[PDB]
Amino acid sequence: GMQTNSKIYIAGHKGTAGTALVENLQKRGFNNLVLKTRQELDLVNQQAVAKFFKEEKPEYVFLTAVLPCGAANVAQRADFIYENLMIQNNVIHNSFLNNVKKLVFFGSGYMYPENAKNPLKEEYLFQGDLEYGAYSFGAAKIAGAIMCESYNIQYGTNFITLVLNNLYGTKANFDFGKSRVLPALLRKFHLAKLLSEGNITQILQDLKMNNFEEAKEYLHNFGISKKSVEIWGTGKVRREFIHSDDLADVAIYTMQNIDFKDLISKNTHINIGTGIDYSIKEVALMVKNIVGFSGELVFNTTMDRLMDCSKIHSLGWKHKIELKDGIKMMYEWYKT
Amino acid sequence: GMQTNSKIYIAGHKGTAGTALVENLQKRGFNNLVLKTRQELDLVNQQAVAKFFKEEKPEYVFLTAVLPCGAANVAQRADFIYENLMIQNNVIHNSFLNNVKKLVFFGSGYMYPENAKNPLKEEYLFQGDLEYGAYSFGAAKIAGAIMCESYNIQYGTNFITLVLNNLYGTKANRVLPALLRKFHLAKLLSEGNITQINFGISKKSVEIWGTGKVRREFIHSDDLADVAIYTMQNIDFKDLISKNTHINIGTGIDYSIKEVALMVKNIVGFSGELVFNTSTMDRLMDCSKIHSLGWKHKIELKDGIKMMYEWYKT
Ligand SMILES: NC(=O)c1ccc[n+]([C@@H]2O[C@H](COP(=O)([O-])OP(=O)(O)OC[C@H]3O[C@@H](n4cnc5c(N)ncnc54)[C@H](OP(=O)(O)O)[C@@H]3O)[C@@H](O)[C@H]2O)c1
Ligand SMILES: NC(=O)c1ccc[n+]([C@@H]2O[C@H](COP(=O)([O-])OP(=O)(O)OC[C@H]3O[C@@H](n4cnc5c(N)ncnc54)[C@H](OP(=O)(O)O)[C@@H]3O)[C@@H](O)[C@H]2O)c1
């Protein structure tokens, strides 16, 4: 499909997936990208989106823009459904109206039933109720997948949905209270190692503090000590991770090689991932070993999510970046 | 809630439910109504809907507007999801932005799994796959119900979803009107009234495709208007609790297509024969929840069909 000079729109280009798509496309020599910040183009606004498509006429679209659901903002139950449905509707429909050749949309494993068997098959859609916290976000993602398929059936569009669980990259936010599970664990174990070695000066520099008494209390409160790191929960819940370079790779592979006609007329979405999951305990141990911390884990007191990737494997794509290598890259970056 | 002087918006006011809401509201003294035709206000257009709410500031909203899915237009798989999600989103979100006091949204039994047990309980949402033809339409209806509930949880709104199976009315446009008209035409043929005059209609018989064993539940539009008004006056979100807070409405009784066809035949007075040519999803609501909240239907099917036919003959 796409050539060097094809006009390619990446919606939500400043996010984790968006940034990875822009960087990988540029590295591969694609030099006709169209990018709009949130301030330039509000994707919830139908009139602004309609005018953009009419005036710019992109040939290919990667739809990465989202209001994401997590632990910190789970109260925004109405916003997760309204905003995500509007972004999906505005982009998908105006792509159709302006003769976009092909579009890739990203779904979430929260679209599958809370009690579904792992590994999750594409045909598990609608086989039971969704998890409570992510209920409205998951429902929006189902509607996005069904929208893509419905345009493909009625109008012969080529709009493909790729569904993933947890995304990470080399460059992460390591601020406490703001960091996801991998960067948070990495920083905890790095600090614990410094404590065990008696490197007071480096602790103060890492934390941006000038009083060690205050530093020791902050570490003690976040479960960090010279002998152990404290982990909330039993450590038994299992998670699958995909590196953003692998997300970019499969998205571009799909655009170039996988058409709607190859998938058929229900459950035509495609799961993506590495096909391997890890308990929180196993992840913590891997991080401990990469950092080189000589101490222990301690636990203080239930839905697993792992894709069945049989479909995408059958279509000729597999991941390159194993989780231990991805964590290693993140740690090297952190130390700069 | 509503007072007789409260400003009330009925979206989609020319349809079957809309017409009945307008008439029943006016009969009770609720005359401060705001009504817009499709030509005046396209509910898929976000900018037009946002401007309408800002200018008119309705206090109460009945959302009846829809692109309906039937046998004749089942090819419109994309339009069913896109158009219905846009109407729902535009009306619900702009109601919130403009401090609407209460809203009623109408769902469909196509939101429930194809193989769910009848009678259908509210908790059967997401317990299996939807019927293939109605898959995209049912998905849109699920999103509408979840949108109402999500605004109620995050923002403390009072947006209530009522879910039904088959609507018919005195002033109506679909299975019941079509059977009524088929039998009326057959009767006219047998009486030789050419002036007044492949659908299986002849002077000696009406032939219906299928076994006519499939079962359907019907609600008369005056009963839909009655329960919608009852909900506005008496049922708040706090009374329903925090999941599956939609409410089934209906009569609680179903009929095979054969039984319905016979009832219509007898009311019309066609003297010929009914024939089924034999070359599967039932839909009946469990109405225990709405009954527990203090409403039940008044119009039995035989009487409702009689009302519809009298109107038709004018
Ligand atoms: N673990 C994961 O991150 C994960 C797991 C499952 C699926 N996914 C899916 O993968 C896709 C990409 O996720 P991500 O992690 O890369 O997202 P992200 O890092 O949260 O980025 C989202 C981007 O969308 C933009 N955006 C949101 N609303 C907008 C609006 N109204 N107008 C314009 N731009 C808007 C944001 O702009 P601002 O920067 O201005 O805020 C941001 O740049 C999404 O569809 C997501 O659901 C990701
Ligand atoms: N009918 C049933 O058996 C049944 C069963 C299940 C649930 N329901 C639900 O009950 C509600 C009422 O159904 P109904 O049978 O009364 O519907 P209806 O007779 O089909 O009426 C629909 C109305 O919506 C209007 N409309 C559609 N798209 C519009 C748009 N873009 N802008 C403005 N107006 C628009 C139509 O205007 P025009 O007249 O100009 O086209 C029409 O007046 C719907 O939510 C429906 O899903 C009905």
Coordinates of C-alpha atoms in Angstrom, one line a residue, chain A residues 15-333:
Chain A
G15 CA 1.3 10.0 22.9
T16 CA 3.3 6.8 23.4
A17 CA 2.0 4.9 20.3
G18 CA 1.9 8.1 18.2
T19 CA 5.5 9.1 19.0
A20 CA 6.7 5.6 18.1
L21 CA 4.8 5.6 14.8
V22 CA 6.2 9.0 13.8
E23 CA 9.8 8.0 14.7
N24 CA 9.7 4.6 13.0
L25 CA 8.0 6.0 9.8
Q26 CA 10.7 8.7 9.6
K27 CA 13.5 6.1 10.0
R28 CA 12.0 4.0 7.2
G29 CA 12.1 7.1 4.8
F30 CA 8.4 8.1 4.8
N31 CA 8.5 11.9 4.3
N32 CA 4.9 13.0 3.8
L33 CA 3.4 12.9 7.4
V34 CA 0.6 15.2 8.6
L35 CA 0.5 15.9 12.3
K36 CA -1.8 18.2 14.4
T37 CA -1.5 18.9 18.2
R38 CA -4.6 18.9 20.4
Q39 CA -4.5 22.7 20.3
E40 CA -4.5 22.8 16.5
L41 CA -7.3 20.1 16.1
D42 CA -9.7 18.9 18.8
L43 CA -10.7 15.4 17.6
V44 CA -14.0 15.5 19.7
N45 CA -15.1 18.4 17.4
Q46 CA -17.0 17.1 14.4
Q47 CA -16.8 20.4 12.4
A48 CA -13.0 20.7 12.9
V49 CA -12.4 17.1 11.9
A50 CA -14.6 17.3 8.8
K51 CA -12.8 20.4 7.6
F52 CA -9.3 18.8 8.2
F53 CA -10.2 15.7 6.1
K54 CA -11.7 17.8 3.3
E55 CA -8.8 20.3 3.2
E56 CA -5.8 17.9 3.7
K57 CA -7.1 14.6 2.1
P58 CA -4.8 12.0 3.8
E59 CA -4.3 8.7 2.0
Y60 CA -3.6 6.5 5.1
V61 CA -4.6 7.0 8.8
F62 CA -3.2 5.6 12.1
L63 CA -5.8 6.4 14.8
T64 CA -3.9 6.4 18.2
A65 CA -5.7 9.3 20.0
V66 CA -7.5 8.3 23.2
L67 CA -8.6 9.4 26.7
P68 CA -7.0 6.4 28.6
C69 CA -8.5 4.7 31.7
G70 CA -6.2 4.0 34.6
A71 CA -6.1 3.9 38.4
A72 CA -5.5 7.7 38.9
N73 CA -8.5 8.8 36.7
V74 CA -11.0 5.9 37.0
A75 CA -13.7 8.4 38.3
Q76 CA -14.1 9.8 34.7
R77 CA -16.6 7.1 33.7
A78 CA -18.7 9.3 31.4
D79 CA -15.7 11.0 29.7
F80 CA -14.1 7.6 28.8
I81 CA -17.2 6.6 26.8
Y82 CA -18.2 10.0 25.3
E83 CA -14.7 11.3 24.3
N84 CA -13.5 8.0 22.8
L85 CA -16.8 7.4 20.9
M86 CA -16.6 11.0 19.4
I87 CA -12.8 10.6 18.4
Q88 CA -13.6 7.2 16.8
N89 CA -16.8 8.4 15.0
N90 CA -15.3 11.7 13.7
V91 CA -12.1 10.1 12.4
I92 CA -13.6 6.9 10.9
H93 CA -16.6 8.5 9.2
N94 CA -14.7 11.5 7.7
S95 CA -12.0 9.0 6.5
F96 CA -14.8 7.2 4.6
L97 CA -16.2 10.5 3.2
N98 CA -12.8 11.6 1.8
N99 CA -11.6 8.3 0.2
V100 CA -8.9 7.3 2.7
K101 CA -7.4 4.1 1.3
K102 CA -6.7 2.3 4.6
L103 CA -7.0 3.0 8.3
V104 CA -5.6 1.2 11.4
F105 CA -7.4 1.6 14.8
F106 CA -6.1 0.4 18.2
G107 CA -8.4 -1.6 20.6
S108 CA -7.7 -2.7 24.3
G109 CA -8.0 -6.0 26.1
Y110 CA -10.5 -4.4 28.4
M111 CA -13.0 -5.0 25.5
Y112 CA -13.0 -8.7 26.5
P113 CA -15.1 -10.3 29.3
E114 CA -13.6 -10.1 32.9
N115 CA -14.0 -13.9 33.3
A116 CA -12.9 -15.0 29.8
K117 CA -10.3 -17.8 29.5
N118 CA -6.7 -16.8 29.0
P119 CA -5.1 -16.6 26.4
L120 CA -7.8 -14.3 25.0
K121 CA -9.1 -15.3 21.5
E122 CA -10.8 -12.7 19.2
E123 CA -14.0 -14.7 19.3
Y124 CA -14.4 -14.1 23.1
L125 CA -16.0 -10.7 22.3
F126 CA -19.4 -10.5 24.0
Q127 CA -19.0 -13.8 26.0
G128 CA -19.6 -12.2 29.4
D129 CA -19.6 -8.9 31.3
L130 CA -16.7 -6.4 31.3
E131 CA -14.6 -5.5 34.4
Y132 CA -16.2 -2.8 36.5
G133 CA -13.6 0.0 36.6
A134 CA -12.9 -0.2 32.8
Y135 CA -16.6 -1.0 31.9
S136 CA -17.4 2.3 30.0
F137 CA -13.9 2.5 28.3
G138 CA -14.2 -1.2 27.1
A139 CA -17.7 -0.5 25.7
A140 CA -16.3 2.4 23.7
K141 CA -13.5 0.2 22.3
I142 CA -16.0 -2.5 21.3
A143 CA -18.0 0.1 19.4
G144 CA -14.8 1.3 17.6
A145 CA -14.0 -2.3 16.5
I146 CA -17.6 -2.9 15.3
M147 CA -17.6 0.5 13.5
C148 CA -14.5 -0.5 11.5
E149 CA -16.0 -3.9 10.5
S150 CA -19.4 -2.4 9.6
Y151 CA -17.9 0.2 7.2
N152 CA -15.8 -2.6 5.6
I153 CA -19.0 -4.7 5.1
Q154 CA -21.5 -2.0 3.9
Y155 CA -19.1 0.2 1.9
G156 CA -16.0 -2.0 1.2
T157 CA -13.6 0.2 3.2
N158 CA -10.3 -1.2 4.5
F159 CA -10.4 -0.2 8.3
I160 CA -8.5 -2.7 10.5
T161 CA -8.6 -3.0 14.3
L162 CA -5.5 -4.3 16.3
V163 CA -6.1 -5.1 20.0
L164 CA -3.4 -4.9 22.7
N165 CA -3.0 -5.1 26.5
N166 CA 0.0 -3.0 28.1
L167 CA 2.2 -0.7 26.0
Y168 CA 5.7 0.5 27.2
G169 CA 8.7 2.2 25.7
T170 CA 12.4 3.0 26.3
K171 CA 11.7 6.6 27.4
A172 CA 9.2 6.6 30.3
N173 CA 7.9 9.0 33.0
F174 CA 9.7 8.0 36.3
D175 CA 8.0 10.5 38.6
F176 CA 6.5 8.7 41.6
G177 CA 2.7 8.9 41.7
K178 CA 2.8 9.4 37.8
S179 CA 4.7 6.3 36.6
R180 CA 3.3 3.0 35.3
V181 CA 4.4 -0.4 36.7
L182 CA 7.7 -1.0 34.8
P183 CA 9.4 2.5 35.4
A184 CA 8.1 2.5 39.0
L185 CA 9.6 -0.9 39.8
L186 CA 12.9 0.1 38.0
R187 CA 13.3 3.3 40.1
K188 CA 12.3 1.5 43.4
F189 CA 15.0 -1.1 42.8
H190 CA 17.6 1.4 41.7
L191 CA 17.1 3.4 44.9
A192 CA 17.2 0.3 47.1
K193 CA 20.5 -0.7 45.5
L194 CA 22.0 2.8 46.2
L195 CA 20.8 2.4 49.8
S196 CA 22.5 -1.0 50.2
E197 CA 25.8 0.5 48.8
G198 CA 25.6 3.6 51.1
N199 CA 25.6 6.0 48.2
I200 CA 24.0 8.9 50.0
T201 CA 25.1 11.6 47.5
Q202 CA 23.5 9.7 44.5
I203 CA 20.3 9.2 46.5
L204 CA 20.0 12.9 47.1
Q205 CA 20.8 13.7 43.4
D206 CA 18.1 11.1 42.2
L207 CA 15.4 12.5 44.5
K208 CA 16.4 16.2 44.0
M209 CA 16.6 16.7 47.8
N210 CA 19.2 18.3 50.2
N211 CA 18.3 16.6 53.5
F212 CA 19.0 12.9 54.1
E213 CA 16.7 12.5 57.1
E214 CA 13.8 13.6 54.8
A215 CA 15.1 11.4 52.0
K216 CA 15.2 8.3 54.3
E217 CA 11.5 9.0 55.4
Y218 CA 10.4 9.4 51.8
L219 CA 12.0 6.0 50.8
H220 CA 10.6 4.3 54.0
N221 CA 7.1 5.5 53.0
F222 CA 7.4 4.2 49.4
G223 CA 8.5 0.8 50.7
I224 CA 12.2 1.1 49.7
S225 CA 14.9 -0.2 52.0
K226 CA 18.5 -1.5 51.9
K227 CA 17.2 -5.1 52.4
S228 CA 13.8 -5.2 50.4
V229 CA 11.3 -3.5 48.1
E230 CA 7.7 -3.7 49.1
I231 CA 5.1 -4.8 46.5
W232 CA 1.4 -4.1 47.0
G233 CA -0.8 -7.3 46.6
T234 CA -0.1 -11.0 46.4
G235 CA 2.1 -10.7 43.2
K236 CA 0.0 -13.3 41.5
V237 CA -1.9 -11.2 38.8
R238 CA -0.5 -11.7 35.3
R239 CA 0.2 -9.1 32.6
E240 CA 1.4 -9.1 28.9
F241 CA 3.6 -6.2 27.7
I242 CA 4.4 -4.9 24.1
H243 CA 7.3 -2.5 23.4
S244 CA 6.3 0.5 21.3
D245 CA 8.8 -0.3 18.5
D246 CA 7.0 -3.7 18.1
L247 CA 3.6 -1.8 18.1
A248 CA 4.9 0.5 15.3
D249 CA 6.3 -2.5 13.4
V250 CA 3.0 -4.5 13.4
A251 CA 0.8 -1.4 12.7
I252 CA 3.0 -0.7 9.6
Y253 CA 3.0 -4.4 8.6
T254 CA -0.8 -4.4 8.8
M255 CA -1.0 -1.2 6.6
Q256 CA 1.3 -2.8 4.0
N257 CA 0.2 -6.5 4.0
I258 CA -3.1 -7.3 5.7
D259 CA -6.5 -6.4 4.0
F260 CA -10.1 -6.9 5.1
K261 CA -10.6 -9.5 2.3
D262 CA -7.9 -11.6 4.0
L263 CA -9.9 -11.8 7.3
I264 CA -13.2 -13.1 6.1
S265 CA -17.8 -11.9 8.6
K266 CA -17.7 -11.3 12.4
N267 CA -14.8 -10.9 14.9
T268 CA -12.5 -9.5 12.2
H269 CA -10.4 -7.6 14.7
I270 CA -6.8 -8.9 15.3
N271 CA -5.0 -9.4 18.6
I272 CA -1.4 -8.2 18.8
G273 CA 1.3 -8.9 21.5
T274 CA 4.2 -11.1 22.4
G275 CA 2.2 -14.2 23.4
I276 CA 3.9 -14.4 26.8
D277 CA 2.7 -13.1 30.2
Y278 CA 4.4 -12.6 33.6
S279 CA 3.1 -12.4 37.2
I280 CA 3.9 -9.1 39.0
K281 CA 6.3 -11.3 41.1
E282 CA 8.1 -12.5 38.0
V283 CA 8.4 -8.9 36.6
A284 CA 9.8 -7.6 40.0
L285 CA 12.4 -10.4 40.0
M286 CA 13.4 -9.6 36.4
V287 CA 13.8 -5.9 37.3
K288 CA 15.8 -6.8 40.5
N289 CA 18.2 -8.9 38.4
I290 CA 18.7 -6.3 35.7
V291 CA 19.4 -3.6 38.3
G292 CA 21.6 -5.9 40.4
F293 CA 19.9 -5.4 43.7
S294 CA 21.0 -8.0 46.3
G295 CA 17.9 -7.8 48.5
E296 CA 14.3 -9.3 48.5
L297 CA 10.7 -8.7 47.6
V298 CA 8.1 -8.4 50.3
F299 CA 4.4 -8.6 49.8
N300 CA 1.6 -6.6 51.6
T301 CA -2.1 -7.4 51.1
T302 CA -7.4 -10.6 40.0
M303 CA -8.2 -10.5 36.2
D304 CA -5.3 -11.8 34.0
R305 CA -4.9 -10.4 30.4
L306 CA -2.8 -12.2 27.8
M307 CA -3.6 -12.3 24.0
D308 CA -3.8 -15.4 21.9
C309 CA -1.7 -14.2 18.9
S310 CA -2.5 -17.3 16.6
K311 CA -4.2 -15.0 14.1
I312 CA -1.5 -12.4 13.7
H313 CA 1.2 -15.1 13.6
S314 CA -0.8 -16.9 10.8
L315 CA -0.7 -13.6 8.9
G316 CA 3.1 -13.5 9.0
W317 CA 4.1 -11.1 11.9
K318 CA 5.9 -11.9 15.2
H319 CA 7.4 -9.6 17.9
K320 CA 11.2 -8.9 18.2
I321 CA 11.6 -7.4 21.7
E322 CA 11.4 -9.7 24.7
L323 CA 10.5 -8.0 28.1
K324 CA 13.9 -8.6 29.7
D325 CA 15.5 -6.7 26.8
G326 CA 13.0 -3.9 26.9
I327 CA 13.5 -3.3 30.6
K328 CA 17.3 -3.3 30.0
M329 CA 16.9 -0.6 27.3
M330 CA 14.7 1.5 29.7
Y331 CA 17.3 1.3 32.5
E332 CA 20.2 2.4 30.2
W333 CA 18.1 5.4 29.2

